Symmetry: D2
Subunit: 112 residues, 4 copies
């Protein structure tokens, strides 16, 4: 199906845009835990937050780590999971949360 109309709506309204939500999953100690997730280049037109779902459990929406100098942004699952990383046998879903209307969009999923 041809969705180029949607892409050129974004081109027309933003003109110059670069993003990279390729998930970079950071492991903890021991290595079987997933401690965090980094996106190399997030969108910055709003102060987006992130919601984390662990094995079907909503861990909530927390304060974002500041966007780093390279444009990356990191989500630290220890802030969502009571100070512990997430066992890599569990599904992890990460949603961006629009601060203006509260919408949320799946941007990463860990599932071994």
């Amino acid at each position: 199906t041809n969705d180029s109309a949607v892409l050129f709506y974004i081109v027309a309204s933003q003109k110059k845009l670069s993003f990279d939500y390729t998930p970079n999953w950071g492991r903890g100690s021991p290595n079987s835990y997933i401690d965090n997730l980094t996106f190399p280049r997030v969108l910055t037109n709003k102060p987006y937050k992130y919601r984390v779902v662990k094995a079907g459990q909503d861990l909530g929406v927390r304060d974002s780590y500041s966007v780093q100098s390279d444009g990356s942004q990191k989500v630290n699952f220890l802030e969502y999971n009571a100070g512990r990383g997430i066992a890599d046998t569990q599904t992890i879903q990460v949603y961006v949360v629009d601060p203006d209307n509260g919408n949320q969009y799946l941007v990463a999923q860990w599932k071994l």
Copy 2:
């Protein structure tokens, strides 16, 4: 800003479509309480669920009532609010939840 390209992407992909999410807020007793919300004609291509947020407090997701033969669908806030209606002095935000990815989209908002 001109979004006709998005509108006609939906036309080209769907061809014939009718929906009606005009919020019909159902009042309780006393009349100052809002007990529910009915949409006259919801989308039916998935088994959508609804999340309710009351004055910024996330009430979560519940099972949906069936789409009615006239196309309407009811969201009963008593199912979300521990058996109680919501005072109309509080903000009510209702999100449709996509079951394929868990995304949520604001479709109705009460705010005095």
Copy 3:
């Protein structure tokens, strides 16, 4: 691909919407000719125009006919093809034209077989 986000953007911005662009191809005399196209329920948020392309040849834009009381709108190819229908052996493409920015979107195609 899951494009429900695009649909609910339209839901959120329009709230109540009904359209039907199922093509209804009207034939002339001889019945071999395609003389017009009717859409049962067009969008009406702007005074859209239509461009017609006849077997790859652009026939340009013309003023649109009024949207009818039942919601339908007719595109009359005699207006685009100097008073004659289009032989049904030719492909026909019909684009809606946004009057604000001049964008064009394919909304109907006639092609035999």
Copy 4:
């Protein structure tokens, strides 16, 4: 008015994307003529074409110039306008044309 749903649809389906359609208009000689337009980083998933409209006159579609090694792509108005630049007192509209369906999307406008 909030279109983040559309933006994150593109994020979710494309994951990593960079484009730049900031118009770099090239003037001719004399300087009052607009001879061309360059986009620094175009989309490349289709062999897109360009339509040019000058002062309400549709000049049609032409062969696209190749996307260069740096990602940029140029629209030469002399190819559309019979060997002449466009006087800068006229409106210019440039549309990207989807080769799959012939749709056209405005990407640059002079006045």
